[PDB]
Each structure stands twice: as C-alpha cells, then as structure tokens.
Amino acid sequence: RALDATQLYLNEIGFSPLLTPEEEVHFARLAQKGDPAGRKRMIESNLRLVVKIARRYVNRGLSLLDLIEEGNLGLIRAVEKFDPERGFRFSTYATWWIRQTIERAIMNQTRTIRLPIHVVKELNVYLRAARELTHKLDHEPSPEEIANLLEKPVAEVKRMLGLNERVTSVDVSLGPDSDKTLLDTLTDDRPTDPCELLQDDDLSESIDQWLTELTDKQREVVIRRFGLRGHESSTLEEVGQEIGLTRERVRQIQVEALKRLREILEKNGLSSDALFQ
Amino acid sequence: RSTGSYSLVTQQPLGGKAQFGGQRFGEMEVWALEAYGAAYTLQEMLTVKSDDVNGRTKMYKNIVDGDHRMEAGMPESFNVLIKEIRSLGIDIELET
Amino acid sequence: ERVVQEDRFTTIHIQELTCVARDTKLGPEEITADIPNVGEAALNKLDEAGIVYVGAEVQAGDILVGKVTPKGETQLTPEEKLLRAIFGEKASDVKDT
Amino acid sequence: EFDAIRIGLASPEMIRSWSFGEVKKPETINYRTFKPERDGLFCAKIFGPVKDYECLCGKYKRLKHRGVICEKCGVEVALAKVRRERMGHIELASPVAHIWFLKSLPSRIGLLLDMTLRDIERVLYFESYVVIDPGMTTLEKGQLLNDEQYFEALEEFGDDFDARMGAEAVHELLNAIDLEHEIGRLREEIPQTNSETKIKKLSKRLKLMEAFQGSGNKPEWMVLTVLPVLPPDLRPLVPLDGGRFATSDLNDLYRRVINRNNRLKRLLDLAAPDIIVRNEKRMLQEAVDALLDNGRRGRAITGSNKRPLKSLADMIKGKQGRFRQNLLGKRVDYSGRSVITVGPTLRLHQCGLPKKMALELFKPFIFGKLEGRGMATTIKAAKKMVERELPEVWDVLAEVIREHPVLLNRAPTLHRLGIQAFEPVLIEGKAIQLHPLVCAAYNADFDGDQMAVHVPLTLEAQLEARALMMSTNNILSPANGEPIIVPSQDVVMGLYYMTREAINAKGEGMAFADLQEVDRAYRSGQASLHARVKVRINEKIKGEDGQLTANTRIVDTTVGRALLFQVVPAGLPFDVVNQSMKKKAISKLINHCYRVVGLKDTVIFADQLMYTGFAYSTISGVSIGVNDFVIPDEKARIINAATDEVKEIESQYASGLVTQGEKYNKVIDLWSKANDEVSKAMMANLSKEKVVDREGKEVDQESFNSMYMMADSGARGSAAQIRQLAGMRGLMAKPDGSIIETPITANFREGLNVLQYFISTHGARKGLADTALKTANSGYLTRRLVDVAQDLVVTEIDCGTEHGLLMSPHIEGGDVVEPLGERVLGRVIARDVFKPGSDEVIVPAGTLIDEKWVDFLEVMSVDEVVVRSPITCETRHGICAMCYGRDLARGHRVNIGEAVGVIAAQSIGEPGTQLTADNVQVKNGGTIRLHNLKHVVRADGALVAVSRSGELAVADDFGRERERYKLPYGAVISVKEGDKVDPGAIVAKWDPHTHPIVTEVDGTVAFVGMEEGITVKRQTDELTGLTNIEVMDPKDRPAAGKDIRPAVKLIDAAGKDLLLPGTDVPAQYFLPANALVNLTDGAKVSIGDVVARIPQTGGLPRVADLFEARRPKEPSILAEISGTISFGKETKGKRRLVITPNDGSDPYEELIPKWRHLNVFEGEQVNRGEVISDGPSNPHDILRLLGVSSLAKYIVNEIQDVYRLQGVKINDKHIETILRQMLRKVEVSESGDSSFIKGDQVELTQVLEENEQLGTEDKFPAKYERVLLGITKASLSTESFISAASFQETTRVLTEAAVTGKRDFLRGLKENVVVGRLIPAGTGLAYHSERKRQRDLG
Ligand SMILES: [Mg+2]
Ligand SMILES: [Zn+2]
Ligand SMILES: [Zn+2]
C-alpha cells in the first residue's frame, strides 16, 4: 500500500494523551535529581506542539522532517535547563528554545558555503527591507534605491547583496533539448595544454643549460639572486654579505651577466617581440 | 585541431578558446576499425588521443624527439568509473 | 573566372563583437589604453579611449578594445622573473583580457 | 599489465582502507577565502592539495618537500592531481540497508532470509518487530511481532527471547545465516515436492547460497555501517564569471547525510527515549538511499529545480551514464572536417588536403622537424615560425606528409568502407579533394557533404593504414566478390560512347597495321571515333599456367574499341573490349582483371579507365534538350481508345449491370494494360529511330540519342524513369493503400494539370517520410547484430570436421535464379564429390573452390556439393579459418585474427536502408523424375498421389534438375515416370478448390447412417444439375443426431473384411461437412475415388522479425511422429488430434484449436516433416522436428528473398555467421545432472560430457536438445559484466555480478575498448598470444 516517512511518525506521537495542567509540577521537580520516569512523559507530551511550529516555515530551505527533528533538539535543552521556582507556567518556556533552534538550524543547513552566525543575522535585514520596497507601487527591485531606505552607503549595499552565494548546479540541461550538460562544457585553468606543458619544460631546460656557457663565478651570483638552481629568492644585500663580501661589486657583475644572456637569447631565435612583445 | 583545452572531470577535448573541439569517434567508426585489422589505430584513438593526462603529454614529447611507439596508460573514463562504483559500496579491483 | 572577376556571387557579411565590463570583487573592469606585454604595432589602431577607429582594416589577431583586470596573489615562478629582467619589462598586476 | 578485473561486495574493513580520512563537518569552503575547510567534503588534509606542490598554510611549497607534512595548517605535499584518487568515509552511527540489493527484480535480501520484499521494508522503517533465535518460544522466526503482541512475549517466556527492530535486526539476521548449514537443509527438501511452482522458488534460492560461499562475500556486507566518499575532483565546485559558483548534485546529497548522521550521534548521548530516536534513524535510511540511487520508494529531494536530482547511480545509467556516453562517442585530437570536392587528376591512393588544415593536423611533426634540421633551437621559437607562415615552413610540411597517410570517414558509417586511408597532397583551397571512384563506397555526393580527417601518430598505426586501410587494398566489396570501386555514371558514359559501333561513318573499311596507327588516324580528324575498320593487334594470353605467350591477329572492330585496348593489361585478350561496354560489362572486366593480373596492375588500370572515360565524354558534348524526350505518335491512339472503353463501362454502372467492386477492378486493370502498351511503343521508337545511308539506302540502326544512351549504358536512369518523361506516368498510389481510378495520362515533358500534380504529391511525401524510418529501423538492426556476433573471430586454422550442409541451386520456377556457380564459389568442400561412375572423384579433399574450379564443376553433371559452414563448425570460442572460406575483399582465404563476425553484421545492416495453383506445366524439355512420392497406378493409365512430402522434378539430359514443382494431395498425374516431357504441355493436374480424397481398395462402399434427414441432405440443382450425395454442416444437424457422424465402411466385393497393411483398424473414414459423394452406394471405381471433397510482412521489418525468431500471428501445425493421424471430439470445444504410430509403439496426443481451419482429413497417414494446417511457421518447431540442416536452409533462403527482390546481393556466409551465434545455447530435457531445469551453453555442456564419459561414470544420460534464440536474447548470455553493462541495464548487471564475485576476463572485443587494451582481433592477436604462452607457461 501507500507508506510514507511523515505520517508514520505523526501517528506514533498522536496516541499519547495530553498532560494535565496540574501534573507537570510533580515531574519537573523529579527531573532535577535525575530519574528516567518523568522526563520521558514530559517530552512525549510536547511532541504535538513542535509540528505546528515547524509547519510555519513552509517552502524554506529545509524539509518538513528536518524542521520537526531540529526543534526536538531544543526540547531536551529546555527541560534540563529550567527553574520551577517561578511557578507561572511550563509550556511557554519550551516553545522559546524550540523556536530558537529552528533559526540556528535553517541558516547553517541551507546554503552550500556556510555563513557565520554574526554576518547571517544582518543579511536577513537587507532581504526583508528589499521585499517591502519592491511592492510599494509598481516598483522594480534594484540595489540603488534600497541604499537610501536603509541609510547604507553605495559600496556597502553592493557587498551585502553580493555575499549571497546562490550556487548553481552543473548537472542541468542547458536549453530546451536535454542532450548537453553544463559540466561537460567547462574547462580548467590549473591544467594546461600538452603542447604548452612541453613548451615550459623546454624553456626551463634551455635557461639552465645556457648558464653553463659563461664564467664559473657569474653563474653562482645569478643562481643565488633569483633562486633558479635549487635556491630561494633573496636580495642583493643578503648575497653580498657573506658569499659576495662586497657592497657595489656584486651589483656590477649582476648587470653585466644580465646583458650577457640578452645577446645569446636574441641570436637563438628568441627575440623580445616573440616572448615579451 | 591538434591540441587545446580539455574538460574538468573527463579529460576530453572541447571548445571555448576561440576554437572548436575535436571529431567525435562514435561506435560506428569503432566497428569499422574492428572490421579491419587495425588494433593499434583503434587503441591510439581511444587512449592517447583522449582521456590520458600522462598519455597525451608524453606522446607530444615523442613526436618532437623523433620516435613514437605507444603510450597506453589508462583512460580517464575508466579511472572515474572505478571511483564511482567503489563509492556505491561495491569493491572492484584489478587482479592482474 | 569571369564570374569571379566581375564580382557576381560576392556577398557582404556583418559580424557583431561585444565586450562587457563587469565588477570583479577584487576590482572593477574599465576600458583603458594601456596593455601589458604588447608593443606599438598593437596600440596604433586604438585611440585615447581604447577603442579602434571606424573604418580601420583589422586582420586576424588584432585588438579591438582595451580591457585589463586587476589580479592578486599571482605567485610568480622564480624561473620566470629571471627572464623578465633580461629585457627589462616592469611587473604589472593586471591581467590582459 | 592487469587481467581478470574482479568485482565483489565491499567489507567495512576494506572501505576504511580506501579512505585517507573521515569527514565530520558538512561545509565545503570558507565564505571569505576560497580554501577547503578542515574535516569537510572539500578538505586538503583528507584529499590532495589544491595547488601544485603546495599546502594550505604555505610552509612547504617546493619540490624538495614531498614526504614532509606541515603540522600547523599544512597538508601532505603532492602533485595536486591525487584529488581524483583520494577517498573518504563516514562512520555511520546506525546501519543502513543498500537499495541496490533490496529493490530489484530478485530480492537479494529477501531470498537470502526467506522473507518478503514488502515485509523487509516494514521492519527497516521501525514499524514491526522480528525475533532473533526463537528457540523454545511459541513463535517462529518467520512470524513477526506487533506493538501489542511484543509486550506479551516478555511476560509468558521471559528467558530465551530476543527481538529487535530496524536495520540492526536485518544485520543480526545475516550474522547467524549458517551458510555451511543452510545449503544442507535445501538439498534434502528439494526432491520431495513435485509442483513446478515450488521448484523454481527453491532452486533460485539455492543457487544464491553457493555464490556467497565460494566468492568470499559474507551476507553481513549487504548492509553497510560506513560509506565511502567520492573524490572532490569528480564532484567539482568551480567558480563562474561574476563570482558565481557552480557545484554538483552530490555535494548537497553528501551534506544531507552528514547533517543527519551528526544529529543522530548527538541524540544518543542525551539519553533520548525510543519515541524520538526511532524517527531519526529512519531519516538516515532515506538520506543514504537517495544518495545511492533515485527513483525508488524514497523520493529524491527537489528544491528550486525542475529535474528531481542526479545521484551516484544516475551517473552510470539512464541513457546518459558515464559508461554509456563514452561507448557512443569520444572527441579525439589530430582531427578536422571540411566539405568534399571531386578531383579528377588524383590517383586512387591519394587525396587532396588544404594547406591550412595540414599546418594544424601535422603541427607536432613540424616542431620536431625544425629542431632536427637546425632551423629552430627551442620549441617556443619553432611555434612562432608557424604563426608567421614563413616560406621555409612549407618545405618542411611537404616532407612530413610525403609517406604519411591520413584517414577519411563520412558521418554515416554503415559498413567497413566508410573509413579509408589516403596519401594527402597539398592543394590550394578549403575543400577536401576526393577521388571520383571512391565515392561509391563512401556513398558521398557533392551537395555540401563533409568528411572528417584523422592522423595516425605511431608507426604501428601508419603501417595499418597502408597495409590494411588503404584505398587501393579494399577494391572488392567485403559482402560479395564484386568490385566496389567501379566507374560511375560519368566514366561509364565516355566508355559507352567510345565503344558504340555505327553503320556508316568517316573512315570506314580502312585497315591499320597496329593500334598506334589508329590513334594517329583519329587525332588527325580523318577517322570517326566509331567506324568499322580492321586493325592488326598484338595481344598476350595468360590462360596458360606461367606462359605469357603473345599472339598477333587481325580483328574486325571499331576505332573506339581499339583505342580502349591500349590501357588493357597484357594478361587479357581483345574479346573483352569488343562489346558496347555497359556498366555491367565493365564491373565484370575489373573483377576478371583482378583474378588474372593481380592487384598492382589493376589499381593502375582502374585509374586509366577513369582518365579515358573523362576524356572521351568531354569530346562528345552529350546534352539533354527538349527534343530528346521523343513522344510516340501512337500514344494519342491508345489514350483516346482507352478513354472510350471506360465510357461504355460508366454507362453500365448507371444501368445496374456491374457493381462498385466489379467496376473498380475493370478500370484499374484497363489502365494498367494501356500503360504497358505505351511503354513498349515508346521504347521501340526511342531505340531504333536513328537512320543512316550506306551507298544509298534507309537502314535502321541503334539510336544515338542522349536520353537513350544514359539508360542503355546504365549510367543514370532506368526504365521506370524514362517512362515518366516520354510515356504516360500511369496510375498513382495513395497513403491509404488504394489506387485512384483516374491515372496521370501526361508526362513531365508535356506538363501536368493542377489535379494531376496534387495526386503525385501523395506518393512523394510518402517516400520522403519513409526515409526517416529507414535510417532509424535499419540502424537498430545492425546494432543488434553486432552485439551478438562481436566475439566471433577466426582463431583456429583447421578444425578437422567433416560435417557440412548440402548446397543446391535454386531451381524454383522455370530457370535457376541462382545457380551453383556463385553459391559454391569461395567455400571449402566437406565431402569428396563423386562422378556417376565408380572410384572417380572430382575434388581430392576439402579444397578452396576458386574461379578455376567453378567451370570444372559446370562441365561435369555435378549438382550437389557438401561445403563447410560456420553453423556446423566445431571450434570452441571462435570459428575455423577453413570453415569460413574466401569471400572477402581479398582473393585468398580468411586469415587468423580476422573479425568475421563484425564484417557479417555490417554486410547485412548496410543495405537495410534500401528495404521497404490449379495445374502445373513443364516449361523446358527433359525426363521427369519424382522423389519421395509413393503413387498407386490405376486401371485407366493415370497416377494418384497420396503423400505431399515429395515433388516433381524435370531431369535434364545431362542429369541435372532444373525445374521443381509442388503438387497438392490427390493431384492426378498425366504423364508417367521416365519419359520425355513436352515443353509447354501439362504433366499433372490438381484441384485447389476442393481437396480430393483417396481410396485404398475397391469395393461396394455405402454411407452408413445416412438417413438424409439429420446427418446429410439430398440436394438437387436446377435441371438435374446435381445428382450426388451432398453432405450437410454440423450446425444444421439435429440435437439428437449431432453425436452420430456419417462414416463410410469399405468392404470387399466377395464379402470378406479388408484391412490395410501395417494398421490393425480398417480404412473407416468419416465424411466431413460440405462434401459430395460422386460414387453411388454399392458401385465405385477401381482406384482414385473422391468420396469426399473438402472445400477451402515484407521489407525491413520482415528481416528484423526473422532474426528475432518470433512466432507468427498464425503458426502452422506440424506432425511429431510419423503415423496415422485421426480426429477426436468436435462438440466439446477443441479438436483432439490423436495419432497412432505405425512403426513404433508410442502414442502421443495433442490438442488443436477450432478457429484454425485444418487441412488434414481422417484416416490418412502423415509423416514427421509434413504440414497439417496452412500458415506461416516459426523457426522453432522446424529445428526440433527436422534438425539444424533444415533450419539453416529456411532462414537463409527467407532472408535472401527480401534482399534479392530489391536488387542487392549478400553472401550466405554473413547470414550463417549470425545464425551460428543464435544456435549457441542448449537445453537439457531431463533433470538429475544439471542444477536447474533451464539450459546452458553448448561449449560448457560438451566439455563436461567428455569428462563424465571417460571417468567414473559409464554412460552419459544427461542429453540435450538444440534451441533457437533471437538476436536479443542470445546477446544477454555474456559471461562478462563489463561489456554486459553497455547494452543491458547497468544497475541490474552490477548487483548480480557483485554477489557472486564474478571475476571478469578481457578476452573479448567490447571489454578491451572501454578498458583501453588491445583487441584480440586483427593485429592485436599477437599481443594476446605472446602473453598467454608466458603466463600459463614458462
Ligand atoms: Mg549530399
Ligand atoms: Zn602548511
Ligand atoms: Zn572448423
């Protein structure tokens, strides 16, 4: 027959009777010392109220079963954290933690990129103020006219509205015909072309091989400045401190060895217009 | 087309860089090569010309060096298939 | 060859090419006349605004409008900075688009 | 490097081994910075790093740090590509059941626990309780407990009771499954039952128990406690333009499971009651179930989107899975496409390639040639030289394509010739220059068609393009032996006009000393192209073995025929060019040239015919004008006469003489006669109109008309198209299927009216819309034929068998439509043929019959031959090379490794786009011989036939049968046996209206029980037109007399009892309804007494339904045992077709319906291969009642009849190759040695019969019977699971192969394609052979 995971839970909680308004005083005092007899009856009696609260958040990000189960997490926290010294009521205190738990769960389990609780609270203000303005009188929604109603700068409103991720799906058929997907047409920026990969490996080996066709002392100062022969980046004063042992003499051989590779590069068929343009 | 950009998940040729992609080698052309005796021509168009990160880059280096024999490796369409079946709670490996 | 010399079956085709300037979170996109890693032969056809003149013969690969995007955290390769010092080109933090 | 890809269930201990970490948080990335957060779906600590050789913190970002892992915020330094291999795992707090092993056609969990599918779904949702280890309680393990029934169990028993609910209960039921004990219980309880409703249920449950024992998969692994996580690069989260991100449909599914798993883990430590924790564990069920597959009982999430979702299983199924999308196409490099263009100056082995395409296709080959020559130092400088198009780059490009072939293929690849290799030459332009002769194989016209190009890279692929895929190698068709590269309409037009003898022309009667003087006289304009001359010719003869002897003779030919002999090779005589050189005559010359001089002298001869045809078709400026469609002057005398013959009929329709249907057939057959009268009067005036003058005369010669030449030479146009240009168009059809009364009496030269043109549009759009189905139905047929005969490949050189099928020419009708010349050409003989003499054979042994043996068999009177066929081969897992033959693109026989199963499916599916008895009389003269026809000679001198299994044949004076006619039952034979028949005279007469009867002996026979008031009725016609005993119907009989039936009792004249030999009961036959008795009561003829007279889809879907072995809408009824058949009870509702065997003691009774009109009578003996009721017969009962030799004859001759009607021709080897794969499975009749009642393969059943015979067992009582399967069911029988997941359902073949631990090998074609290995067929056979001898040996 027809079976669903929604009505199977509602029929199980609908068999427990309602708690009398004069019987919860004996169960609340016993829960402080610790006993698994009054806590089971107190939570089971409040299961009929979490459904009416979860039904108010219709067409939201979370489903109906996720909203009912999230509200039940606050019921245990509300019972264990309470004080019966007031004696005014007890059902009005459980609905404060159940409603607070839905808001903290509907903003952390809705979007893909999780937003912190300090920036997501003020984001609902810009979205709520934008709804009333668009329906004033044949009005069109825009980010320019909303900056004056909230006294917000022009650069601040563009960042708050742009903070919404609103991620799309790549497994969607673009167009009327369902024959092509969005993921099959995307490219990558990190990986390169097989010809470009060999082009970078050839130039990297030609640069290191050209350094051997020079003086034995001019190749050591250039390998320590830029860090090409297995070295790191450094400055001119650091190389001329201990290895260089000079102030301006290291800077003199650096400008001569810089132009020495310029003439050997132009004669090799690789001019400035072909690489640097 | 000789080379160009490739897709993200399946390393296959595609357009988008002011250039078209490649020619789709369907199953009808595979049966034509299987009807012939071209076994190396069929394996080349299925492994070293598409879905091979270590196959396309190493074959391009061979054409420039002068010699060219083969670079089979393993197609990326089958490497992704193994990682998807394993994610369904079904073990699949190579006995060799 | 008479039907080709007399321009019988010759047709004119008009093609439209658009360039949009969006607002990247790092910086806005503006139409300018300064392009990195180019020469005078590529900037002579443009103007003080950055768009080619009406009536200019454009070949394959010419620049129509000027548009650069700001970049951040490029992480240049140390083998690349040694090659830029050979000619003497300055480092610019703007991607050519 | 790997083999035997195995598949099985994943254990929880192995799932943790694949993973590199456990995910705990449901987020993916940070909102401010775009970095993977820790312990999430995207985490660089569990998976690989994002950037190349760099961690998240940045403490190590060089190559020298590989194994060092940063401790503060860094990760393991890797190549940033391991994000496709690293996996994760989520240790679930509660077990979850797998839907793949739960919701399928077989219940993998239900059959394993003897439980219902609906009942398991009830426990997994926390609704009912089950009992674990019942023991000494009052309930059974199969009995469930409810919420009110479970509370009572703990009160009466207390001890020895354990009940659970949910997924932990199913996991507990599989812990104590007792695998080594449950099989012992099923073996002792299966033979007790006898009903088939329980045999199929206990055996299907038994075969699943042995699968979980030998494979190693424990039943505990069907439910999982930890699930793997897909790598992040397979579910990418990449940004888009404008800061927008785009994720996959698996991130929100993986996030939904983590959100509910962490919520359940926190709900267990708070000591929450069972009312709230049972609903959270229920949500975790459908959370993981919706992640694995979608469409099951758990509805997938649908939020702000139209399509439901794309889960993990949806990536490998649903006509869009990653496994099936690659099997139908894959983009490749080094390719391109452009339009095609005719090049008349190219050779057969070369094509034209633009310079702009050659620079891009051969780009890597130029970079390597510039560095080797010294023009460029680095690859970065060589790339800039190609962009500038330097002049020195063209000299390099011309050298890299000199001997480098390229592949050209058209978009519709119907057969093997769709891909051919050519040597590209550099041409100026943007269009690919194609050869005019290769346009027939490609099926390509110059209307804007495009052709794709491909570049073979390795020299292994370059040698395969030159030795196998070259255009000069595949000059013959792979389906027949005829050349596929033949001169088309433009070349055959120049060769027909050149060799076209004229009566009187310039330079007639002159003599030439050699062929060089003929060209010298023609080029000077002093001799016509076709004039009767006499030229001395020096030719060579190749008829002698190894002797190329030259002969000089003076022949009498024309000028054009002598110029054509200059290009003919030396091995051919001059008599081959003395004809008119039509299209059918040139194709037979290229085929004869291929078998004499070889291939090298033929590829250079077909190019000379194209140059000679293009040269002489331009000199003669043939043109079609308005005066070429000549109209016969007698067409108006036939149309005006036929119009008056209909006016006299319309007057009879208004008077009431004829009806509507009688007038319809009168005017339809009238215009069809006048249409043929105009067509024969048009061709007579069109063909013999050219008149000439020879020394003064008016002589009629053949017409030198442009419209006549194009139809006579066979270039373009036929008799049905010239008929609509000059003669009347005729009667048009209608989409409903009827013919319109008013025909189109006008042609296309005179023009049609407005109503005549609107009528022709009915059949125009009917044929155009039919082409859309011809490409959709035929493409589906050639795809099903490949999926069956793909594994079939030539593997063995010699089988060593003597079995074979008999081959006889089609003698149906007057003449042989297909003699033994082409039916035996290319097939190895099985048994030695014998001459009519003794100890004299023609063939010595099994030999390959070539063109030299066909004429040797035509001189002799040999008519039957036993050849080898694949359907009778004995090679296991393959087909023999000697059983195939030599009918292919090559002259020799088939080689080892040739995939003959793929070329057979492409030979049948390629021409699929072209697909949509009163008396006998001997035509020729010869002796008359009857076979399998037992006749009884009467006293008058005539013969009467009692059997129908035989037929009448006409024996030639040489001893060959050339005419075969079928005769019904009781057909009177006029001539005798062994006499010379008269050509044009009758030999026998029949009666198709009323089925006659036969009598065994003479005597005074009378009707018993014929009171003429209830059973029969005395009928009298007008003026004594009928004086006999007329029978009555069964419905017209009375209620009391309906049980009694009229019967005739045969008694002798002396009074003694007469009994037929071989049968105990006498010849007592009951007369059926609607019968007339010619013989009176008490007086009859000596023999041949008719006591009772018994009164009386095509095209492409026909071939498709014939390969599927489907049962027709009205199957025929055949006999099982050779014996005397009889009727039963008719008033019950059925017909008991009882039959008593006369040779053996084994009665078999069968039932037959009553709506099917039977054609057999009571008291007649029928044979085993005799048909009882008329109608089409399925190929299933013909295989059981007759055998495999009769099935191979009926299927092949029925498929060829659909192809021979349209004009195409396919060899019989391609139909018998597909038939071999259909007759592959076998079925056992008795049980006791097999596992189930079904059947297995014949290759496995034969290897087990030899071990049981020559072993411990003496006899082999486990017999079998051959069964026939379609091209749909035979394809499902595949031992592999990789190839079976392509054309079948993916989610159904993966759950079956997992629970059995099916180790799949790669010994096929379809498996090695998706995996990436070499194929066993072709050149890849040497790779699989060198590995088999080194793996299982040393
Ligand atoms: Mg066309
Ligand atoms: Zn780090
Ligand atoms: Zn054989």
UniProtKB/Swiss-Prot annotation, chain A:
GO MF annotation: an example: DNA binding
**One Gene Ontology term, aspect cellular component:** cytoplasm
Region (Sigma-70 factor domain-4) location: 210-263
Which parts of this chain are annotated as the region Sigma-70 factor domain-1? 4-37
For the motif Interaction with polymerase core subunit RpoC, give the residue ranges.
66-69
Q: Which GO terms describe its biological process?
A: DNA-templated transcription initiation; negative regulation of secondary metabolite biosynthetic process; positive regulation of chemotaxis; positive regulation of single-species biofilm formation on inanimate substrate; regulation of cell motility; regulation of cellular response to heat; regulation of cellular response to oxidative stress; regulation of DNA-templated transcription
Q: Where is this region: Sigma-70 factor domain-2?
A: 42-112
Query: Where does it localize?
Result: Cytoplasm
Q: Which UniProt keywords apply?
A: Cytoplasm, DNA-binding, Sigma factor, Transcription, Transcription regulation
Q: Which residues bind DNA?
A: 236-255
Q: Where is this region: Sigma-70 factor domain-3?
A: 122-197
Q: State what this protein does.
A: Sigma factors are initiation factors that promote the attachment of RNA polymerase to specific initiation sites and are then released. This sigma factor is the master transcriptional regulator of the stationary phase and the general stress response.
Record text on subunit structure and interactions = Interacts with the RNA polymerase core enzyme.
The text of the family note is:
Belongs to the sigma-70 factor family. RpoS subfamily.
Q: What is this protein called?
A: RNA polymerase sigma factor RpoS
Q: What is the lineage of its organism?
A: Bacteria, Pseudomonadati, Pseudomonadota, Gammaproteobacteria, Pseudomonadales
The shown range, given as first to last of full length, is 58 to 334 of 334
UniProtKB/Swiss-Prot annotation, chain B:
Per the record, the coiled-coil ranges are none
Quaternary state and interactors:
The RNAP catalytic core consists of 2 alpha, 1 beta, 1 beta' and 1 omega subunit. When a sigma factor is associated with the core the holoenzyme is formed, which can initiate transcription.
Protein family membership: Belongs to the RNA polymerase beta chain family.
Function (record text): DNA-dependent RNA polymerase catalyzes the transcription of DNA into RNA using the four ribonucleoside triphosphates as substrates.
- What is this protein identified as? DNA-directed RNA polymerase subunit beta
Organism of provenance: Pseudomonas aeruginosa (strain ATCC 15692 / DSM 22644 / CIP 104116 / JCM 14847 / LMG 12228 / 1C / PRS 101 / PAO1)
Report which part of the complete sequence is shown.
1261 to 1356 of 1357
Swiss-Prot record, chain D:
Report the catalytic activity: RNA(n) + a ribonucleoside 5'-triphosphate = RNA(n+1) + diphosphate
The entry marks the following residues as binding Mg(2+), namely D445, D447, D449
Protein name per its UniProtKB record: DNA-directed RNA polymerase subunit beta'
Which organism does this sequence originate in?
A: Pseudomonas aeruginosa (strain ATCC 15692 / DSM 22644 / CIP 104116 / JCM 14847 / LMG 12228 / 1C / PRS 101 / PAO1)
Query: Which taxonomic lineage does the organism of this UniProt entry have?
Result: Bacteria, Pseudomonadati, Pseudomonadota, Gammaproteobacteria, Pseudomonadales
Described function = DNA-dependent RNA polymerase catalyzes the transcription of DNA into RNA using the four ribonucleoside triphosphates as substrates.
Of which family is this protein a member? Answer: Belongs to the RNA polymerase beta' chain family.
A GO BP entry is:
DNA-templated transcription
HAMAP family membership: RNApol_bact_RpoC
Q: Which keywords does this Swiss-Prot/TrEMBL entry list?
A: DNA-directed RNA polymerase, Magnesium, Metal-binding, Nucleotidyltransferase, Transcription, Transferase, Zinc
Name the gene: rpoC
